[PDB]
RNA sequence: GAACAAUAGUAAGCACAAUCAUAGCACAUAAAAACGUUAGGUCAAGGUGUAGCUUAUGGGUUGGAAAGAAAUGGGCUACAUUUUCUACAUAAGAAUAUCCACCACACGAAAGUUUUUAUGAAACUAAAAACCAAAGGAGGAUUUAGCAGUAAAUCAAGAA
């Protein structure tokens, strides 16, 4: 049985995001790519760099906004700037959200030496595609 | 092959800036060596790794400044606390064997 | 099976399509063929509308072919037909008017007749009964028999020739010897027939 | 074969010129047109050649620079395929010897087919009528 | 008749196979009697019409070019080989493939016979003059390609009935058979690595 | 921390090998040449075999960058086969997808 | 816990199915394939529970890791004539274990010996020459694969 990136069937109560309900063989068919950048195209360079950068961003964001991250991150890279886009549960007061927006954007901008944008979309509770 | 052809060729090399005088197959390697970027100098090589020290250090500090939250390190901690409580800890250096 | 079961085999015969007006049931039949909006498999490269191609010669060609070489096997067949031809033209001019009326010079008819003579009547299948394997006389289908003939020809004229000797030579020899019934191939056919008489009692074990 | 390249080799494995051959060196002198009372009728070939491509039938290609330059003004006679009459005559000659043993070779059909498959080339036609 | 799916959509209700069967059988009983007007109208909700069934080909309009009369075009594709064939009705029999004679380009008898097939089939064997461009594949694949293309080109010159004949000889259909992809963990796209029982 | 001591070793190796690249090149120029006399080349030989042993490039290993796996690496992402699959199967590798054909 | 001329079963969900891919259909192939089964495989991908080491079961440097009594699996090349060599696309020329008195000698050398070359700080590694030309003459019991562009044979490219 393939197990990769799967959410197994429970007794039938389990809430499952649109993302988690689709096994890897559905990529580019039904669900799309959680990142976008030029690097993996035919004649292009520095794929490796962008991969590591990506991994660090998911980890970092997950730790910077504890408990409030709804679904996995979306990373768009365009002409030297990265727009991070996130689905966020409403947990914190908007004070904490703006504090973390600014803190993050500046921090990562100085880390990766490129302009970083952060776009928060706010959601009452984890959007539910299936079971439940 | 003629003398005319060889004079022409010599002129072609001298002009386009390739090797003028006749060389061995074995010696041309020298030119190759300076034409290129030596392997250990390519960014794909010396820059291969991310600096793991900077990532680990920076995110550690940012944890202590209470910005970043590391659940892995937290897990490690709580496990360890419960382990020293149960009585099996890490021996202070030098103590364990002989005692 | 890049063709669905929907696809019918093509009919290559030109004579069939050229002269329709005299047959009612067949007019109705190929009417139902095309008008059924019936799909047709694309006519294979081997088969042609050629007035010159004998499906038996082509089968034999194929059974001779090792690896992917049609070119080489079609060569050997062509050369063999030419060799039988010239062997009989040799036997014709050194003969007298009577034997010039008797002797066959068509290599095609010689091929066919030599196969008809070499095809077995009856055959043997092993049957397990009471923990023993008995060899039992079995009637054979037509196709099985033709196959046995061709395969026996080729097996012999591959196996038993001296390494100096070329294939079209040995094959033309055995074709002509099987034409007259004295070939080793025919001896094989008889060995089968005799093994089938020796066991005739066991013909009861066959349940079909 | 006189001015071409040679396959034969010394024990040194080093190839030898056609000049190096006594037979060729002397057979070259016979073509030089220095003499009276004689005529030299030559044929430039493919089928037996060396180092020439299979599709080259033309005199200067087969003879090369050495060949054509040392061959002097000569008469370039072209040999082509059977025309309709030549062809029909050859077929009739085969039928007279009853060398076409195929039942349907006496039809007009058989002639159209042999004409097409052989392109009424003599050697090709012989090959096609040999196994027929 | 409607499919079960359609009926199921018309009642806004799930159905069973035996259900659908029952109903259809009943409509059959109905139509097998004298049909009233309201009855005909009734059973005709449950009709659908299957769309056009004709397999007749689409004849290429014949073409007249630069004072030259009657040339037709066709394009075959077989197995990595593409072939474009232009045929002239006004010419004598010969065939030029990639600028050379067809006896030179197709040394093998079998391929020449393949090229011969459609002409010999229509008895056009002396009457037409063709130029070809064939690329890719091997020799036999190219012969096949030109075969198909030639066949498709000669449909302009012939009668509508002989077109049906060529189709029924399998002259006009592309050959779908193509190389299968090798599969990982096997050897040959079918051939398996040797299997050891013990 | 690099994930493993081995990785550490490798980092050092790449540093040293970067540092001495110029010396190594300049000397192996002499060494690889037929034109110069053999007497220069034997001295140059001892010269380059004098250099620290961890400065020579053949001693480098391309290792998985996250997981430190020594082989089963795909050069383009500098990733172990396992980690590569783990990222691609969550769709975090842009333009990578399972292959059907 | 079914019987359709129907007798107690409705059921959402997941699988199958359908769709998607292989650049048009179709077919094929690919992909997919739940719940579980084998305490199946992997603490040496990484991470980890429990238990262990801590001037060592940790971290470095230098050099070594041999080898073939024997048994065996999977491959490669063969044992030749549907062959071998050369030219060359598929019509050629020659060779052809036997000739004969005498050697010499066919197919097979991928193996070894010598000399070179590539890569490398390091040649033991790979490649090309020349020499050498052995076993092998189509294989016991028993066994593997393949349903069509498949098997078979031939060619090429890539990953590291
Ligand atoms: Mg195969
Ligand atoms: Mg570790
Ligand atoms: Mg290495
Ligand atoms: Mg249910
Ligand atoms: Mg599709
Ligand atoms: Mg399907
Ligand atoms: Mg599968
Ligand atoms: Mg499915
Ligand atoms: Mg176990
Ligand atoms: Mg184990
Ligand atoms: Mg561990
Ligand atoms: Mg072994
Ligand atoms: Mg294996
Ligand atoms: Mg030999
Ligand atoms: Mg060989
Ligand atoms: Mg060296």
Task: Order across the sheet with E129-135: list the strands.
Answer: E63-65, E68-78, E81-88, E129-135, E94-97, E100-101
Check F92 against A54: CB less than 8 A apart.
yes
Please give the residue of chain D at the shortest CA–CA distance from E103. D119
Residues 19-78 of chain D with CB under 7 A from strand G are: 47-55
d(CA B52, CA B49): 8
Residue F97 lies in a domain: no
Our measurement of CA D7 to C1' G88, in angstroms, reads 13
Is the sign of the CA dihedral E10, E11, E14, E17 positive or negative? negative
Residue B22: CB less than 7 A from any atom in strand G: no
d(CA F65, CA A54): 14
| Domain, as residue range, for F41 | 1-91
d(CA C88, CA D95): 17
What is the Å distance from ligand 8's center to C178 Cα? 58
Residue A66 contacts B, CB cutoff 8 Å: yes
Residue with minimal CA–C1' distance to G152 is: C67
Interface test with E, best of D82, D116, D127 (most E CBs within 10 A): D116
Residue F57 lies in a domain: yes
d(CA F56, CA F48): 10
Count structural domains, chain F: 1
Please give the residue of chain A at the shortest CA–CA distance from B73. A63
| Strand-strand pairing, A35-36 and A74-78 | parallel
Residue F36's CATH number: 1.10.287.1480
Residue F96 lies in a domain: no
Interface test with C, best of E113, E116, E162, E180 (most C CBs within 10 A): E113
Q: Which two tokens stand for residue B42?
A: 């390519």
d(CA A126, CA B10): 76
Across the strands, what pairs with A36? A76
Contact between C30 and C40 under an 8 Å Cβ cutoff? The reply is no
Q: How was this structure determined?
A: cryo-EM
Contact between C54 and C71 under an 8 Å Cβ cutoff? The reply is no
What is the b/e burial string over F35-66, where b = at least 16 CB atoms within 10 angstroms of the residue's CB? eeeeeeeeebeebbeeeeeebbbeebeebbbb
Give the per-residue SS3 of E40-108.
HHHHCCCCCCCCCCCCCCCCCCCEEECCEEEEEEEEEEECCEEEEEEEECCCCCEEEECCEEHHHHCCC
d(CA C26, CA D113): 29
Q: How many CB atoms lie within 10 A of CB C137?
A: 21
Residue F24 lies in a domain: yes
Residue F76 lies in a domain: yes
Residue F100 lies in a domain: no
3-class state of residue D41 by DSSP:
coil
* Chain D neighbors (3+ CB pairs < 8 Å): C, E
Give the phi and the psi of residue E192 in degrees, each rounded to 5: -100, 150
Residue F99 lies in a domain: no
Residue F48 lies in a domain: yes
Q: Which two tokens stand for residue E80?
A: 């990595």
d(CA E14, CA D51): 80
Select from F79, F86, F95 the Cβ nearest to the Cβ of A33. F95
Residue E55: CB less than 7 A from any atom in strand G: no
Q: Which two tokens stand for residue C141?
A: 């289908």
Residue C11 contacts E, CB cutoff 8 Å: yes
Chains D and E: 3 or more CB pairs within 8 Å of each other: yes
What is the Å distance from ligand 8's center to F87 Cα? 25
Place of tokens 């690496």: F73
3-class state of residue C61 by DSSP:
helix
Our measurement of CA A93 to C1' G92, in angstroms, reads 93
What is the Å distance from ligand 8's center to A29 Cα? 14
Q: How many CB atoms lie within 10 A of CB A27?
A: 21
State the number of CA atoms in the 13 A half-sphere of B37 facing the CB: 8
d(CA E77, CA E148): 7
d(CA E89, CA E69): 8
* Chain E neighbors (3+ CB pairs < 8 Å): C, D
d(CA D131, CA C172): 12
């Amino acid at each position: 049985k393939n197990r990769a990136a799967r959410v197994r069937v429970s007794k039938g109560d389990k809430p499952v995001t649109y993302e988690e309900a689709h096994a890897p063989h559905y990529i580019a068919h039904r669900k799309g790519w959680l990142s976008l950048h030029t690097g993996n195209l035919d004649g292009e360079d520095h794929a490796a760099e962008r991969t590591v950068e990506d991994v660090f961003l998911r980890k970092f964001m997950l730790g910077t906004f504890p408990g409030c991250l709804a679904d996995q991150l979306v990373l768009k890279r365009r002409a030297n700037q990265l727009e991070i886009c996130a689905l966020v549960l409403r947990q914190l007061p908007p004070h904490k959200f703006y504090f973390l927006v600014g803190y993050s954007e500046t921090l990562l901008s100085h880390f990766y030496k490129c302009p970083v944008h952060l776009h928060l979309q706010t959601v009452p509770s984890k959007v539910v595609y299936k079971y439940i | 092959l003629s003398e005319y052809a060889v004079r022409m060729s010599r002129l072609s090399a001298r002009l386009f800036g390739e090797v003028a005088r006749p060389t061995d197959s074995k010696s041309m390697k020298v030119v190759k060596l300076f034409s290129e970027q030596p392997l250990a100098k390519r960014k794909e090589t010396y820059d291969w790794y991310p600096n793991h020290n900077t990532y680990f250090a920076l995110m550690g500090t940012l944890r202590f400044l209470g910005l970043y939250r590391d659940e892995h390190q937290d897990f490690r901690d709580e496990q360890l606390r419960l382990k020293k409580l149960r009585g099996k800890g890490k021996p202070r250096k030098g103590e364990g064997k002989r005692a | 099976s890049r063709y669905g079961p929907e696809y019918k085999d093509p009919q290559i015969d030109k004579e069939y399509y050229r002269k329709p007006l005299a047959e009612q049931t067949e007019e109705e039949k190929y009417e139902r063929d095309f008008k059924k909006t019936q799909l047709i498999k694309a006519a294979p490269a081997t088969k042609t509308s050629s007035v010159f191609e004998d499906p038996v010669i082509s089968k034999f060609t194929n059974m001779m072919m090792k690896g992917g070489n049609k070119v080489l096997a079609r060569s050997l067949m062509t050369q063999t037909l030419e060799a039988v031809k010239r062997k009989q033209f040799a036997k014709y001019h050194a003969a007298s008017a009577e034997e010039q009326a008797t002797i066959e010079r068509n290599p095609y008819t010689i091929f066919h007749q030599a196969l008809k003579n070499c095809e077995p009547v009856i055959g043997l299948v092993p049957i397990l009964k009471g923990g023993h394997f008995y060899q039992v006389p079995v009637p054979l289908a037509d196709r099985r028999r033709r196959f046995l003939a061709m395969k026996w020809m080729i097996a012999e004229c591959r196996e038993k020739k001296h390494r100096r000797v070329l294939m079209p030579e040995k094959l033309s020899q055995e074709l002509l010897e099987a034409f007259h019934n004295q070939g080793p191939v025919i001896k094989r056919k008889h060995d089968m027939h005799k093994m089938a008489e020796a066991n005739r009692a066991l013909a009861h074990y066959r349940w079909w | 074969a006189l001015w071409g390249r040679t396959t034969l080799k010394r024990e040194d494995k080093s190839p030898i010129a056609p000049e190096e051959l006594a037979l060729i060196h002397n057979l070259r002198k016979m073509v030089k047109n220095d003499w009276q009372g004689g005529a030299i009728v030559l044929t430039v070939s493919q089928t037996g050649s060396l180092f020439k491509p299979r599709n080259a039938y033309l005199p200067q290609e087969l003879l090369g620079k050495e060949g054509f330059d040392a061959l002097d003004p000569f008469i370039p006679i072209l040999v082509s395929n059977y025309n309709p009459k030549e062809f029909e005559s050859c077929i009739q000659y085969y039928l007279e010897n009853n060398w076409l043993q195929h039942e349907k070779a006496h039809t007009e059909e058989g002639k159209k087919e042999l004409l097409f498959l052989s392109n009424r080339n003599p050697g090709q036609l012989e090959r096609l009528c040999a196994y027929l | 008749w409607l499919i079960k799916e359609e009926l199921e959509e018309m009642l806004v209700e799930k159905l069973s196979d035996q259900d659908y069967a029952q109903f259809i059988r009943l409509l059959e009983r109905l139509s097998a009697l004298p049909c009233g007007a309201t009855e005909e109208d009734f059973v005709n909700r449950f009709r659908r019409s299957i769309p056009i069934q004709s397999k007749k080909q689409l004849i290429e309009p014949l073409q007249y070019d630069e004072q030259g009369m009657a040339f037709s075009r066709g394009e075959g594709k077989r197995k990595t080989a593409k072939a474009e064939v232009v045929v002239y009705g006004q010419g004598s029999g010969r065939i030029d493939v990639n600028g050379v004679d067809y006896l030179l380009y197709f040394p093998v008898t079998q391929d020449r016979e393949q090229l011969m097939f459609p002409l010999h089939f229509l008895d056009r064997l002396g009457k037409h003059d063709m130029t070809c461009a064939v690329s890719g594949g091997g020799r036999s694949a190219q012969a096949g390609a030109v075969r198909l293309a030639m066949a498709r080109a000669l449909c302009s010159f012939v009668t509508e009935d002989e077109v049906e004949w060529m189709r029924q000889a399998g002259l006009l259909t592309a050959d779908p058979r193509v190389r299968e992809r090798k599969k990982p963990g096997q050897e040959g796209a079918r051939r398996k690595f040797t299997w050891k029982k013990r | 921390y690099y994930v493993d001591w081995k990785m550490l070793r490798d980092v050092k190796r790449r540093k040293m090998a970067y540092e001495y690249a110029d010396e190594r090149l300049r000397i192996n120029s002499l060494r690889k040449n037929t034109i110069l006399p053999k007497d220069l080349q034997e001295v140059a030989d001892e010269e380059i075999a004098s250099l620290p042993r961890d400065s020579c490039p053949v001693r480098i290993r391309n290792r998985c960058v996250m997981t430190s796996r020594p082989r089963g690496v795909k050069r383009r992402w500098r990733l172990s086969r396992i980690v590569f699959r783990h990222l691609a199967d969550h769709g975090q590798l842009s333009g990578v997808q399972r292959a059907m054909w």
